[model samples]
Structure formats: structure tokens, C-alpha cells
Target: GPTSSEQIMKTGALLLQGFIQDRALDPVPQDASTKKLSESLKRIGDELDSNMELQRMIAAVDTDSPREVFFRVAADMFSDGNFNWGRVVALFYFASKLVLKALSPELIRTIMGWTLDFLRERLLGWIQDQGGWDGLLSYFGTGTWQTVTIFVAGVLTASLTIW
Candidate 1:
């Protein structure tokens, strides 16, 4: 059986951030089908790292903390109102790298900590409404290109403004 959303929620706060950070970086998906979904997200993260122009654009906004940019990006990602499992995983993947790029062990912990609050308050209901992970498991196929295209296109647009 797929890991229940309840199981993930039950993984508890103390451990959830670590789980999310590690999974986003390497994608240890909780179930069989989710494997593809998480990896699709990983590719988007890789894209951000490889596109030096985009990387420079984002890095130019370096702030005292990562939250300034990360939350702005997350809000933009969710603004379209059609968020699904793919978006959830992509957000996590994006968060992982953005925090790493923040380059502060202190703020890394701070921002990842806020990730929990954001997830529980903002995303948990969305996931549950989708009938949990298995329901969203149907979401895997779409993840392959939908997320790749969405994020890539959006980031490309962001990169263009500076060029």
C-alpha cells in the first residue's frame, strides 16, 4: 500500500523538515508511483542549478534570509489555483535548493523550519482534499511534463526580464 498522507503527517514536526529537505534533494519517495513524481521535481531543481543566468538572477536578490525570496516564489507557484501533487513536490524541491543557496546554516534551519508551518497550514488541507497520496498517485503521469514545463517556462520568463 502507498504511504498514507496520514503517515507522512504523523512523521511529526521534529522529523518532517529533515525528511522534506532530504527527499527534495534526493527524492526518496514514499511509494511506488510517487517515485516518478519526485524525480520530475528533482529535474526542475537541476534546471535551476544549471541555468547560470537564472541562477545569477535569483542570487542577485540575496537577502539576510531566504524566506524573502522563497515564500515569494512559493506564493507565485500556488497562485494559479490548480496546484496538485506535482506542484507540492516541486515546491519542496525548489525550497531545498533555495535554502542551500542561502548559504547560511542558521537561516537554512530557520527557513526549513518555516516550511513545516507552511505545509501544515497551507498544503495539508490541499493534499487531504485530493484524497491523500494514493488519490494523487494518479497525479504521477502528469508530473512528468506538466511540472517540467510549468516550472521551466516560468523560470525562463524570470530569467528573460534580466537579460
Candidate 2:
């Protein structure tokens, strides 16, 4: 089996690609808030693209202190009035790879808390009014949906067999 860290890294890279592609294919609204978000996403994408050492460092970061430092810097950069829902989501997505390298319960718990709060406060209404998870799922293609369905079916089958 691929180790958890390896899985996280691979999935994280794929997710980053999806985020960038989604932004490009469906441009954000031209309003100031979204424009700032788009730019921030671009900057993060560029950093990943250009800075091998940065990637290495991020991959190496696993402890609470370092993860906290990374998350704090990231949160400060895009928090306050400059908030962007999608970009922040992408930031957390990227951070997941690093954070998964070692189990820091408090670190993961806090980051998840922050992410949920941000989504609830900032993006929830917009998402619900705009078609929500299905809309985003469509962008990732039908295969993902199919995979989930099959996995669910397999779980049910196994449960029935056990019973």
C-alpha cells in the first residue's frame, strides 16, 4: 500500500491542478474580492511551479510548531478583508500534504476548524445558492461520482456479508 504521506502528496498535487483548472475554465467574478482571490491563487500556483526548494520544505514540515507557522503565515496572507473562499480552500488543500506527514492531532484539528469556520462564514450561502457540491463535482468529472457510488456499494456488500 502506498503510505499515507505518499497518498496525501499525490492527491494534493492532483487537487492543486484541479483548482487551477477550475479557476481558468470558469473565471471568477470581476469584483474586487474575487479578483484579489484569483491573484492570490495564481501566486500560490506560481510558487509551487517555480520553487522546488519551497516544495521540499513544505513536504518536510510535519510538527505542530512548523505547521502552525506555515498556517499562520498563510492565514494572515489571505485572511482579514482580503479573504477568498476558493483560494483559502486551495491553501488548505496544499497544506494537507505537509500536515499529513506526521500525526499532529491539534494541528490538524485546528486547521480543520479554521477551514470549516471560513467556509461557513464566507462561502456557504454562495455555494448553496449556486448549486453547491454537485456543481463542483461536475467539474471533477463523472468518474469521481462513479467511484463514490461503487465504493458505497462495496461497503454495503461487505456489511451484509458480515452480518
Candidate 3:
């Protein structure tokens, strides 16, 4: 999903830059040109998050009424209320139970911890416009990585149990 969005943003950003350069490259006209690039990225993120294939793949887990699980994850992402990745993790846990039936909780926790570390590195690698503390700070501000790290750990911890 992130990869798809990255490709779109890169291509769209480049296109926007070219359009801007062709028209008003002088002072870099910082208004409509910037707007176009931002709009393209926003649109791409929305598509990646909402595409049917993503929905269906997530739904295929068959955790408990696939439709409900799918709806819940989407709601968690878009709801106006305080969002919780925990709900998504729990849903995954439920869905993955059968797949992880043979694993012990302790082992699962260990695997999840390892996976989260792996994910953190992977996320950093994949993120398009950000890197390290600077990137995390852009949206969440300073110390945001702590929250993110913990949240990721918790979610992955839960996911491994089921997966």
C-alpha cells in the first residue's frame, strides 16, 4: 500500500514540478504549484487506503465475519473519534487465531516484538518524504516516535499472536 502511494506521489510530484518550471520557474511561484503537488499526494493516499483490493485482502482473514472486520479496520482509520490501532490489532488477532493455533503466547509475543522492530526499519525505508526523527516530527512533533514505537510494538505484538 505504501509502495503504491509512494510511486504516485513521486510521479505526481515530478509532474507538478515540471509544470511549474515550464510556466513560472523564476520565483518558484509558491502557490498553485505547491497546491497541485499536495493535492496529488493526498489523492494517492486516499486511493491506497480505500481501494477495493486492499479491502478484500484484509477481509480475507475471515477472523469473524469478514465484512465486519473489514468495516472495523476502515472505521479505525477514518473515524472522527480518537482512533485506536489496538482495535485493528485485536481484530487481526481474532482472525489469525486459527493460523497461530500452535504457537504459545510467549513465543508469539517474542515474534511480535521482533516483527515490530523489523517493521520500524521497513517503515522508515518505505516512507516517501520523511526520515528518522525529522520525519516523525513533521506530523506528530518531537517525541512522537516514542508513541509510534510503542503503538507499533503493541499492534505487532497482538498480530503475531493471531498470525
Which candidate ranks first by TM-score, i.e. highest? 1
Model 3 scores what on Cα lDDT?
0.36
Q: Runs in model 2 with CA error above 4 Å?
A: 1-54, 57-89, 101-104, 142-163
lDDT of 1 by residue, 1-163 (tens): 1245565463323233543455333323354444544454455555545656555565576455467666766666666666665456545655566666655356555766666666766777666666655554465455555455455546444533433
CA shift at 116, candidate 3, in angstroms? 20
In candidate 1, clashing pairs total: 0
**How well does candidate 2 match the true structure, expressed as C-alpha RMSD?**
18.9
| Error of model 1, residue 155, in angstroms | 6.9
- The residue-level lDDT of candidate 1 at 25 comes to 30
Q: Cα-based RMSD of the predictions, in order? A: 5.3, 18.9, 17.8
Candidate 3 residues 1-163, lDDT tens each?
3235444343333333333233122233344433553443333323333444433444456454433443444344324443343332233233333224323234334333332332333332433433321232233333333343444334433333343
Better of 2 and 3 by TM-score: 2
Worst ten in a row by lDDT for model 3? 19-28
Q: Where in model 1 is the C-alpha error above 4 Å?
A: 1-5, 8-40, 51-53, 80-82, 135-137, 143-163
> How high a TM-score does candidate 2 get?
0.37
Query: What local lDDT score does residue 36 receive in model 1, on the 0 to 100 scale?
Result: 46
Top candidate, metric lDDT = 1
